[PDB]
Amino acid sequence: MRILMVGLDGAGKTTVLYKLKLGEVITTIPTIGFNVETVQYKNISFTVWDVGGQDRIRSLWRHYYRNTEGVIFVVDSNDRSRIGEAREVMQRMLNEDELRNAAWLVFANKQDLPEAMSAAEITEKLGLHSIRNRPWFIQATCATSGEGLYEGLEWLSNS
């Protein structure tokens, strides 16, 4: 499965990732590009593109326009900024059809790091409330917290 971590990565969106991968943290320059890992479960080995949603990189991902299989949205839960705007973008994913081949997870990260919204509050706000032709249970992490994640995921590959 191709699992997607998008948003601008360098924020620790990438931290979020590095934490998974080695246990470590962003010891890279804030990272625009594909970051790749394979994580093996159900031995679907999830190939993670942790990709900055920075300008080009957001702009240009067409070769990566193919067909999805897993969704992480790694979240600045202090961002409560680009999300409406995001919602406005997000529609075009919705308007993609490759994009409807994943039972997913939005991950609320960066909770400790300032705060976060109602699990619901966000849910409408990115436009998330509105799906169903993909599952849509919700899971919070932080980026110095997160557990039960895997419940979210559990259902998800086993969709």
Next chain:
Amino acid sequence: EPPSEISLKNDLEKGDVKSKTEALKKVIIMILNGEKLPGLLMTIIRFVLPLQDHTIKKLLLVFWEIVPKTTPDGRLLHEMILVCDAYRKDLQHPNEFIRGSTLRFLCKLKEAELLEPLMPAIRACLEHRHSYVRRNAVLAIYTIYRNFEHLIPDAPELIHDFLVNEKDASCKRNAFMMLIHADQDRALDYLSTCIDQVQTFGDILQLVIVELIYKVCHANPSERARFIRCIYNLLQSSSPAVKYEAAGTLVTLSSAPTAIKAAAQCYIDLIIKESDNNVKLIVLDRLVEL
């Protein structure tokens, strides 16, 4: 309607790297013509940031290098920044050979958006205790100096101080070669310093100075003594290379009857010693000039 591009794609799976190798060769040959039509790029793209296969990477990489890169896609295929970050890491790689090899490549490489923080990256790599790696930077830099010298601007001195830190002859030799091309002056300052020490030392680096000195006088002189002091020491002269040059430089410098004699001798003995005829002729030719 379908094509063998695809035929290659399955092979790659089938083997892994192995099949891919085959693919590289084919690709290569295909590439060699010019020729190709795109799409495998995607494959390449897909598997390669998440894949190893070092040799293959080396093949791949080189392929990129020889082939264009300001590809009608851009400029870049357009990912020339993203993929690099792994590579940058590799370039970062603690793994010294790996960096060095990259560097080697890198000397060949010249892709700018990628370069900029790799400028930082490289700087770190210079520190690595391996002279191979460091040396490789000397080429690389050389490559910059024409392409985007400026990219780094503080360099000529930086090098020059670096020389101070330095002591690996191999690297030194290099250091000189580039240094004079950036600026002679630094070399000269050092030259002043080195003057006595030279004799002790290995030739190759010594050679490089001989060229430099030459160009400047025809434009302007007044400089002699300091040199002379050394030069006389150089009138030991003893490697066949050294000697070969040593008389040759002399004449360049001088032609006093005494000078005429000095060089002459060197030849005559030389010849006498000499064996490769091809060589012999050559000096004549000079002589013929003379």
Next chain:
Amino acid sequence: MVLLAAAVCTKAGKAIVSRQFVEMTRTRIEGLLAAFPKLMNTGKQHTFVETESVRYVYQPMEKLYMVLITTKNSNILEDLETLRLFSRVIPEYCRALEENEISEHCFDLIFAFDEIVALGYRENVNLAQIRTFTEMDSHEEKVFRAVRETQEREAKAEMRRKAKEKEVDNFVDKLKS
């Protein structure tokens, strides 16, 4: 640089393999060179010819020629060593001699040019050792085991988390005068 190309040659009017240190032009520099080489200019023997201030340096080794080219002066011996040296190296590098073997180990061979010679500089000795430098390394491994492992631990653990959750002078004076 002290060589813009090294091309290893076979008798064929054609040079069996080559590499272009610097690209700009097209083969016509190289292509033209190839043509001339194949032609040999009927010329009888002699392992060297320089003409028009261009060294064409070669060595017959058999039906094969190994070729280097240069235009302005050089110290010979060194050079020779190399031609010869090539003639030492190949059966190791690409396996013996017949184009094919080389055809398979092209990558190896080109790699050898670079490796051997960094821009007209005689880099080392010891072929095996030469292997050593890359695609044969050491550091990377050292790092990998420890690291990979460390991560792995984190991963393993994760699996559970996941799972559940005087002289001078003589001259000098004379001159000075």
